[PDB]
Amino acid sequence: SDRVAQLTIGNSTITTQEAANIIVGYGEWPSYCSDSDATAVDKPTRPDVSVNRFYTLDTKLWEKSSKGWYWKFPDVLTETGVFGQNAQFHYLYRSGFCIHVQCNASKFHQGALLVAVLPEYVIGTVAGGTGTEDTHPPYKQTQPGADGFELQHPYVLDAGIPISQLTVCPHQWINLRTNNCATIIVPYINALPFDSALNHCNFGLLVVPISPLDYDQGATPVIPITITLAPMCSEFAGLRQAVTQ
Amino acid sequence: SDRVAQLTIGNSTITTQEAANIIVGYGEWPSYCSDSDATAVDKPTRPDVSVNRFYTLDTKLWEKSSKGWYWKFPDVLTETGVFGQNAQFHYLYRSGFCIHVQCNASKFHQGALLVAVLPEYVIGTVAGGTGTEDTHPPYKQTQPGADGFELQHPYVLDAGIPISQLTVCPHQWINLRTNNCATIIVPYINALPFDSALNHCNFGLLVVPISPLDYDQGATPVIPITITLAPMCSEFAGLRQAVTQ
Amino acid sequence: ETILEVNNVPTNATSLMERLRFPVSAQAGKGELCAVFRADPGRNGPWQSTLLGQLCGYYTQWSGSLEVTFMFTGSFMATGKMLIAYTPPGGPLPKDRATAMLGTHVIWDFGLQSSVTLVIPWISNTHYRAHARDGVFDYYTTGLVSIWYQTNYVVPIGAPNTAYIIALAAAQKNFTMKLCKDASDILQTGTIQ
Amino acid sequence: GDRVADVIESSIGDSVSRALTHALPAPTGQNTQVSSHRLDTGKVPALQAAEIGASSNASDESMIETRCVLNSHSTAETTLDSFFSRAGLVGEIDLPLKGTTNPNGYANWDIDITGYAQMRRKVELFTYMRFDAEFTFVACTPTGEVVPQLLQYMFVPPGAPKPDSRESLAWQTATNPSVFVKLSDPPAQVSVPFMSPASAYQWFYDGYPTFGEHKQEKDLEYGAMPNNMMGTFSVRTVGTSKSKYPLVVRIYMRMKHVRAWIPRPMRNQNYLFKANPNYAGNSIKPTGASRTAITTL
Amino acid sequence: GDRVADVIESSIGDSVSRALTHALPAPTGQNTQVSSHRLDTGKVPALQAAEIGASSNASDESMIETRCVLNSHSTAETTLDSFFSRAGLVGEIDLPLKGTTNPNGYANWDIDITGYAQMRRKVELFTYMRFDAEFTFVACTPTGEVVPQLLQYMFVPPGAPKPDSRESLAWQTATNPSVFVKLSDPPAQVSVPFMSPASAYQWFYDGYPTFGEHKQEKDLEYGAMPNNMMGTFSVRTVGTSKSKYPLVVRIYMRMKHVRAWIPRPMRNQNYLFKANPNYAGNSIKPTGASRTAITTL
Amino acid sequence: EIGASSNASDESMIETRCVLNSHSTAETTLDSFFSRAGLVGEIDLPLKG
Numbered sequence A, B: 001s002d003r004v005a006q007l008t009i010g011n012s013t014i015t016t017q018e019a020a021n022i023i024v025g026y027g028e029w030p031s032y033c034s035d036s037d038a039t040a041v042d043k044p045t046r047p048d049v050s051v052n053r054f055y056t057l058d059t060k061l062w063e064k065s066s067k068g069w070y071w072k073f074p075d076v077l078t079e080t081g082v083f084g085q086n087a088q089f090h091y092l093y094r095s096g097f098c099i100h101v102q103c104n105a106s107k108f109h110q111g112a113l114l115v116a117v118l119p120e121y122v123i124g125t126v127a128g129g130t131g132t133e134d135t136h137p138p139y140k141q142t143q144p145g146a147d148g149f150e151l152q153h154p155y156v157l158d159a160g161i162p163i164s165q166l167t168v169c170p171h172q173w174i175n176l177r178t179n180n181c182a183t184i185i186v187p188y189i190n191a192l193p194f195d196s197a198l199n200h201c202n203f204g205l206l207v208v209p210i211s212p213l214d215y216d217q218g219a220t221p222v223i224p225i226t227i228t229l230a231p232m233c234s235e236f237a238g239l240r241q242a243v244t245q
Numbered sequence C: 001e002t003i004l005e006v007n008n009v010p011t012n013a014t015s016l017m018e019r020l021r022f023p024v025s026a027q028a029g030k031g032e033l034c035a036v037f038r039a040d041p042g043r044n045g046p047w048q049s050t051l052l053g054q055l056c057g058y059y060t061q062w063s064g065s066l067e068v069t070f071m072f073t074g075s076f077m078a079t080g081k082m083l084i085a086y087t088p089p090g091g092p093l094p095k096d097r098a099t100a101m102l103g104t105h106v107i108w109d110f111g112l113q114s115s116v117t118l119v120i121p122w123i124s125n126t127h128y129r130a131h132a133r134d135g136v137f138d139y140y141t142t143g144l145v146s147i148w149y150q151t152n153y154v155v156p157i158g159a160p161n162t163a164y165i166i167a168l169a170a171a172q173k174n175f176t177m178k179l180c181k182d183a184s185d186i187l188q189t190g191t192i193q
Numbered sequence D, E: 001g002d003r004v005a006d007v008i009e010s011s012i013g014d015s016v017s018r019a020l021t022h023a024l025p026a027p028t029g030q031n032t033q034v035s036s037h038r039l040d041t042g043k044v045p046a047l048q049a050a051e052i053g054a055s056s057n058a059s060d061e062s063m064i065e066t067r068c069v070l071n072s073h074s075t076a077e078t079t080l081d082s083f084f085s086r087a088g089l090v091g092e093i094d095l096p097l098k099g100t101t102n103p104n105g106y107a108n109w110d111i112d113i114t115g116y117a118q119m120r121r122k123v124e125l126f127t128y129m130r131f132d133a134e135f136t137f138v139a140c141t142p143t144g145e146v147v148p149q150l151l152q153y154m155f156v157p158p159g160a161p162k163p164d165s166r167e168s169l170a171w172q173t174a175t176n177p178s179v180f181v182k183l184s185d186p187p188a189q190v191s192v193p194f195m196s197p198a199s200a201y202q203w204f205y206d207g208y209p210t211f212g213e214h215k216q217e218k219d220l221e222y223g224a225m226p227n228n229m230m231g232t233f234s235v236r237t238v239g240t241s242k243s244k245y246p247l248v249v250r251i252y253m254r255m256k257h258v259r260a261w262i263p264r265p266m267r268n269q270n271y272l273f274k275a276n277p278n279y280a281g282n283s284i285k286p287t288g289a290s291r292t293a294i295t296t297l
Numbered sequence F: 001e002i003g004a005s006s007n008a009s010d011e012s013m014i015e016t017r018c019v020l021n022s023h024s025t026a027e028t029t030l031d032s033f034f035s036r037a038g039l040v041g042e043i044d045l046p047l048k049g
């Protein structure tokens, strides 16, 4: 009852057998904007199927010497589907997300991941190492795309903050003895009712192994990690020509 | 009251001072499809603003030795806006159209056009001229684009049918002494509730001068003709990857 | 439900039972292709093995939604996930897994419940569909099915590295047929004596 | 929950056809009423504006002085059943002894009304049509002579095996229909339903049937919708050996239970091909006749 | 008209936030109740599953034997006003006689709390904050000595002319506010509203402010939202000639009427720059302390 | 393994619309499938054979 789950939104559908319960980020569901909070006068558009469905990004690999990854949302979908081809036309954007993660393994493998959702995860460089040299992170590390970007110093999450306290955010684990997936639902987290989808990046998904993968020879070494996600309650406003960036 | 008119749909708006009344093609308004007529089970999407607004195609010229033109709908909008970038994704399509035409001139100019809407306007070649040589019309004459295509034999409309009987269709004139525009509204005309937007081309707009343009020297010779149009009650279904053609 | 011959490559009389099932083995994990087939029952292909595809030979037009059920004959200690997809008409065959995803798709985890149901809904301009073939009658093509790897085929020491999947094609409750006729397959050479 | 206001006041989800007009009865022409002279301003029915694209509304009463006339002239013979339900030739099938067309005693005919222009030009006034039918078959030698010969007909729908010979196995006609008939008997005659997948037979399709890079070698499929190719009609002389007699078979169609849509213009140039509106370009004859002077008959 | 059904049953237009939870009062800690021994199956609070990502629910009562305890320990000092409404240093402004920073008797300070880490690390626990404030100004020479000198302050909002000198015309302060004050008087002290266009001060912005081809020479605008730059704070020694006395000015912020959102982790590496979370990479000290053996203290 | 067919439907796998199906099931019956004549025999009565 708590293990088996199904997720049907749009034309698409997900099944899973060895799962856990579902999480709702910060204790509430997505929503469309109120006429009181809102400020813009133009009538939005709300497709409700062509955008609110499961998109599948890219399939990583989990070796024994792996460190971690992150993805920025909603940057991941700005070149993918009728979602992306609306977000280029319009200027204002609002949405939620459901986020599903896959990693399977047998009953001889062992490991644990941490699947967390952090709003406004600014990236910070190392200041040249000495501390004095001021630097800034390039464009391909702040909006790396759908292909993700790998961490170098995961103990501080590349921002001077520990990973030991990342559970205060909406988190889940993937202990390969117990489960094989993590489902997280998130509302729209921002101070402003609408905001751009290309410049601003509202939150970042992280996937960091704590206990490393391990097995014995004769067993399958390739242990992929796949990332699936779906917009929800998507609105758009400010129509004009398409802007890549 | 009958001369001045305004047309507000979407973010856009049209004004005109010397016009005439509005026409409704074949005596009824557009509509969304009924649950009885329809056959497909998937839930459509209905943006209602991003697609149902005025698009402006291209601006022709009207000399004294001009013959005519045509445009195929809805081929004109398959590379233009969130309309076109939905029609490539999906497979099934339904819509109406409002069609507005411009041509201005002073009170010393004279001429008359005929602005007609013909469903299923197949194009026919000349059979080599002799009659025996079987030919077929190329792809750039059946789906010529938004840049339109010019007629060669307008007395038969390039299909063995006279232009003298084109008024039985939804028609209007632009007599430069009287008016300067023609507004035509059209429902969805097809035997099937949904149909593709790329292969099929449901009807063709025609613009043929009957009485030729004429003036005297010292007067402005450039007399453009602009074509404006708006989808209405647009639906889409069958999501998948984008198909140019 | 009746078995579907996705693996219709062999011809010789010893390996004809191999048509019934297609394998899945262990791979790198790049999201790669395994099998494809059309959703056209009355057309020559996998669907002729069925009792559905043989009763649509005695009837021209059809309608309704279809259903394709898969089943996994692997070991209990094996795991994996797959991405089944339905690519409607018009669109070409997907080249990668990130293109078939944009259509109707299902994801299935190997487990106790050893099966999953893909459903091929009714997406058509027409209420009915006469059967399809190469020519202008590809106006009535149904689409494509295109199976992919989502994670990998993982298995421990001691178990086999390769497994087999069996498929099972059928219809739903909105299927109909009309305009009865005679089939193409007339199983007679000369005189039955 | 639909708590916003732009969703409550929305026009989305309107399965109703707003119709400005509404049909009325007219079993007879209109009765001309009486009128008298008028010498007023403002009121002026003669002056119209045709730029709007609507027809006139002036009448005999409001232009001159008329009398009362009680018109009893019916409008029943201008209907569609009374205009279309009249048989006409649609096909011919030859089964000669020795020739080049069909010498082996069989023939296949692709069901297509568009081969004779008396009946094609009536239907090509409309675009979409929904009709039952009633075919009729007239068999005869070239001299008109009547001979004692047996014949078989077989409706071959789409997707069915077309016969390739006279002694074939497709003639068992277990599931297909068929009509045995002799020539000494009267004409054969059967009824037909509306057999399309669509909701109407469209005599004009502006598009291509398939997707693809439309090259010049595949432009012969312009104007081809398979929702009108209703199959094939086969015929043969029954036997194991060849026949003693030539034959010709003529097919007549009679439409009934008709509904039509989309008036459009009428052909004025000679027909050349099928499924193809092509015309001769160097021989564009006018729509009608001609004369020498506008000021003279 | 919404005549279809998929529009009636639609979830579109939902301005309501479905909340699973609901706040409750807690002026005191929870009163521990009495328990006794239990030797049952099924019931098993100790065994949790943390993969779900929720905290435990086992308590003292359901693991061991407790007594009744009537807890009166308040929870009032862990609130945000009782945690943030405590002044701290946020800035310094020097007006020396002869140097290199600000020798001409004026100084501009860009309003930014992020320059001292006792107060920065308290706010960087949260992401979005909405607060009034209460600044306080302490003037003194470097020795701490107090001198008879007159001073002027002027809040320069965005879009206003920054003064470029001591004898400038921007000091008329007709529309801008200002504070004349002496050093012989007590500290100056004024109140501040919530001045942003947005609905909250976000201490963390993940994005760029502008559109464009983001080249490497314009990466210094990463993490810059102008909805927090609340302007500039100017100060000068009143007169036409230079002063006899050096000066230093210290600025203290006290937050009140606070609301916060989005808990997130806490800094463990030393701060280096402003508007920039950078850390030293070759000097990553652990989060805390260390020892020699897990099996030993 | 039970040997029974599936029960999943369009409604419980994806998002559908309302559709009022009027497609008859009368031509799949047995009389409408079998009551169509066909050849079952041949009898020859030649002159000399």
Ligand SMILES: Cc1nc(-c2ccc(OCCCCCN3CCN(c4ccnc(N)c4)C3=O)cc2)no1
Pocket: D111, D112, D113, D114, D133, D135, D153, D154, D155, D177, D178, D179, D190, D191, D192, D201, D202, D203, D204, D228, D230, D233, D275
């Ligand atoms: C026993 C036995 N049964 C029969 C028997 C034989 C034939 C029957 O089908 C008669 C259907 C008539 C079809 C009429 N249409 C509709 C559209 N269309 C075309 C054709 C070409 N181009 C275009 N653009 C349109 C056309 O031609 C039924 C019964 N006789 O023998």
Ligand SMILES: Cc1nc(-c2ccc(OCCCCCN3CCN(c4ccnc(N)c4)C3=O)cc2)no1
Pocket: E111, E112, E113, E114, E133, E135, E153, E154, E155, E177, E178, E179, E190, E191, E192, E201, E202, E203, E204, E228, E230, E233, E275
């Ligand atoms: C007369 C006179 N009036 C005054 C007078 C002077 C100044 C006043 O504004 C005080 C507003 C306090 C602003 C506090 N915030 C909010 C966000 N934020 C930053 C800063 C840098 N980086 C980030 N990421 C965030 C920051 O620093 C009001 C009044 N004194 O003299």
